[PDB]
Structures are given as structure tokens and as C-alpha cells.
Amino acid sequence: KGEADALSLD
Amino acid sequence: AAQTNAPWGLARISSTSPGTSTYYYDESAGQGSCVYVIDTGIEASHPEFEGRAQMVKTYYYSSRDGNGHGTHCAGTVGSRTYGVAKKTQLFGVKVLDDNGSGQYSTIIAGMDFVASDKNNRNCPKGVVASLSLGGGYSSSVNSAAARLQSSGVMVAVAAGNNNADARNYSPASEPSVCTVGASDRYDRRSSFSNYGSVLDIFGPGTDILSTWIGGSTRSISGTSMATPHVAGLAAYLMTLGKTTAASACRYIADTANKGDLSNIPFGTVNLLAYNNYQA
Ligand SMILES: [Ca+2]
Known about the structure:
The complex is a heterodimer.
Chain A: no helix or strand
Chain B: E1 2-3, H1 8-12, E2 23-24, E3 33-39, E4 53-58, H2 69-78, E5 89-94, H3 104-117, E6 126-131, E7 135-136, H4 139-150, E8 154-158, E9 169-170, E10 178-183, E11 201-204, E12 208-212, E13 216-220, H5 223-239, H6 248-254, E14 257-258, E15 271-272
Parallel strand pairs in B: 3-5, 3-6, 4-5, 6-8, 8-10, 10-11
Antiparallel strand pairs in B: 1-2, 7-9, 12-13, 14-15
Helix pairs in contact in B: 2-5, 3-4
């Protein structure tokens, strides 16, 4: 990681 | 062949203009090629994979995708309804936990695994690796990506979602792989997409419909969405015998739609993945 996938976006 | 009312991204990579809804592609559809999805895993039992998907490796307690990110990306690569290469074989390598997190050592181990494992599989048309992940710059991660590409696997990686120069991110910053930027349905660079000289090509990344866990579907955004469009396109072209793993990225750039994107910073390529299908 260090990226994404968190599920409330921007 | 033609898929009507297809997700906008599939339609876009088979057209020279935005706004279409049909995805045109050759029936071969990536058959005979293999794509490794190095992510949170793949829900292999999802009907959309038709049994063409399977987990081969996990670095955690389970091989199950408890997040959904990996299943989403794999679907864009080759699910029957949301995929680019509808007949390709998918292999899942779980390098990220169910929170979408992973340590650099685990990610590197996952890449070396694929380099070796591909030798145990039957992929007469070639091997591709899709890496929809990344973090701050690291010469070790970049190096692992270069090794995988060098071993004969077409490596596609996400540019990152920081709206910054991808030079500061890995494996996005490794020059030898295929760094994918994101675009939206109106041919604008996605607002979150990284950019820079290291980018090789752009792919649909905003509001991408694809498979999800629990046998469902959902639309999300990110350069993580774009990367499987290119990985899938590469597998598709390799099966057609148009290019090889070593030159796929370059071939894709050469045959891309040029100058169609807006809000591309000077110094960043204006190229959008395109399959050049002609019936
Ligand atoms: Ca490159």
C-alpha cells in the first residue's frame, strides 16, 4: 500500500 | 463482437471519441493469455469470472478477498460483463490485507512470486501483471517491478491518486513498467490522477463499474481502476499477436488516441488506451 482503497472517496 | 450498454470505460477504449456505449472487440478476447492481479485477492466464485479466476498465493491468514478492491480490478481485466479481455485466465496474489494495506516487503515478495510462478502455468499467449497499488518512493519496490517486467511479464501499475508528479511514488516511478494515469468519461484527466513524464498512458478511471465481493457490483474511482483496463488491453493484444510482453506498453502508446485529453500538464503524455478494433 501507501495508495488507496479506503471507501469514502476524494 | 459487440457489447451494448457496456460500462463507459470499455466503450471508450474501443472508440476514437467519448460518449459511445458499445464495446467493440475481437472474439478471441484474451484467450490463452494470463493476468496476475496483485491486490487484496479475488472472489473467484463470483459468477462473472465463469471459473476463469483462481487464487494462487496469499501472504495472510486467508486467500479470501475481504476488501473488494482486488475483485473490482480483476473484473475490469476479465469479468464477462465488466472486463476488457473476457476470456483471459486470472490469477490472484493477495499482497494487501482486508483494509487495503500491505508492507513493501510483502509487495516485493508478491512480485518475485509471479516472476517464478508464471513458469508453472500454461499461458501460450503471454503473461500480464496488474498492480493497482503503490506508496512513497522506494528503490527496492521499483527494482522488484523492473525484475518482473524483465522476466517476461507485461507489468502495468497505477500512477497514484495524489494529483501530484508520480516521480515520488513506487512502483509508479519505475521507468521500465507501464504507469497508468486515470481519465473520466468526458476525456478529462481524473482530478485525483497523478501525472508527470514517467506516465506512459491513460485509462478510464472515474466511476468504473465492476465486480465486488458478496457476488455484487459497484462503481468506484482511482488510477487503480485505470490500470486493469490497460492490463486487460495488453492481454487482449498479445492474444491477437500484435505485440509481446516486452513491448506491449510501447505498442499501446503508439496506437493510442492522441491529444484527446484535457487538463493534462505540460510534460505529461496525452495518450488514451485504444484497441483499434475494426470489424
Ligand atoms: Ca514506463
